[PDB]
Amino acid sequence: YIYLAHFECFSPPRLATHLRAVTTHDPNPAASTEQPSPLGREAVEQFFCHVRAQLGEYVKHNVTPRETVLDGDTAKAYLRARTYAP
Amino acid sequence: TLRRVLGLTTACVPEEDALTARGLMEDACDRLILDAFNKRLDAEYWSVRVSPFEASDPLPPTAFRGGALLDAEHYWRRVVRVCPGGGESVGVPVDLYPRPLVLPPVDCAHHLREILREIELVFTGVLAGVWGEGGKFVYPFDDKMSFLFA
Amino acid sequence: VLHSLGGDYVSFFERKASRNALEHFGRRETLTEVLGRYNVQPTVEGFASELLGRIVACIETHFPEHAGEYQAVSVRRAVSKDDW
Amino acid sequence: QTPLPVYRISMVPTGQAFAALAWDDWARITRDARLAEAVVSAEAAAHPDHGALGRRLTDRIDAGGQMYVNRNEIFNG
């Protein structure tokens, strides 16, 4: 988590976008071409809000379940075959 | 399965028929592997006749002790792949041991794979022959229904 | 029968980190795909045959005090993990 | 009748004694912590709550020879 989060917020692509969002094309503050930076909003949108949510949604996200349904005599068969004898 | 799948001549776009056919083929595979469990201990049933020309499993040093049973082997060698211990699959020449046989559980995770291989060959032929081609019917044996035996 | 719950890398942290690895570092092709390049459709003993000669040549140079021991051996497939 | 449990017994000074059993005297092993129906039921009567019934009910509690001293059930995949 700690390495993933530090990457997901401060990766080279995200950093490049941020520094291009603060680059100016004029010194006059009222005529500045700098625009709002997408760093934190993008980081929160993908990694952080989702991790705050998983904080039982965690099970739903990380379950990948495989439950095979066996009805009939095969259920009785699977029971004795794979459980300590009665 | 083929009798049921060519009974789907009900008027439909070819694309729909491919899916309602593949579903039935997967269901037939399911009903076959389910019935395979109820005969997991019949080693003679899970036996393959190897010819003296085909590559064969190596003879265990105790199959040379069948007495008046080694004489019956003239053409075919009936072999069943059992799984002693773990990981290792070893072949047992079925007709060179006295009966009733006592064996480790039969490695149905090997015979059923080959039976399923030829079933998918037939099913890929029919799927790509009646309706549009491009579909290799594969049954996820290793994931869906592998647990039953291994 | 719940017989599988994904694995060790189904955690959101694990699934996100793995996806970022491909984007930033590259795709590490699986064992089967790599073996397929050397005409192996898992058959593995087929390549293990020719590999035995190179391995024996290595041992009878770097580890010679047991040299004449693997001149005639047969590769017996024992363990099969998807990367081992 | 199979399948069967397989246990591991640590002895003194050492020695992992494996033991596969088809049946065993578990009534004797759990006899010390077996509370009679009269006892358990009585405690509840004179004592309400499910955070104090349990409090009282808890407060009221050779390889062959080592079998009933140390067992470790072994996972069978």
From Swiss-Prot, chain B:
Changing C12G: In strain: Nonneuroinvasive mutant HF10. It comes from the Viruses. Signal peptide: none annotated. It is found in: Host nucleus. Belongs to the herpesviridae HEPA family. Component of the helicase/primase complex. Unwinds the DNA at the replication forks and generates single-stranded DNA for both leading and lagging strand synthesis. The primase synthesizes short RNA primers on the lagging strand that the polymerase presumably elongates using dNTPs. The primase-associated factor has no known catalytic activity in the complex and may serve to facilitate the formation of the replisome by directly interacting with the origin-binding protein and the polymerase. Associates with the primase and the helicase to form the helicase-primase complex. Interacts with the origin-binding protein. Interacts with the polymerase catalytic subunit. This is DNA helicase/primase complex-associated protein. It comes from Human herpesvirus 1 (strain 17) (HHV-1).
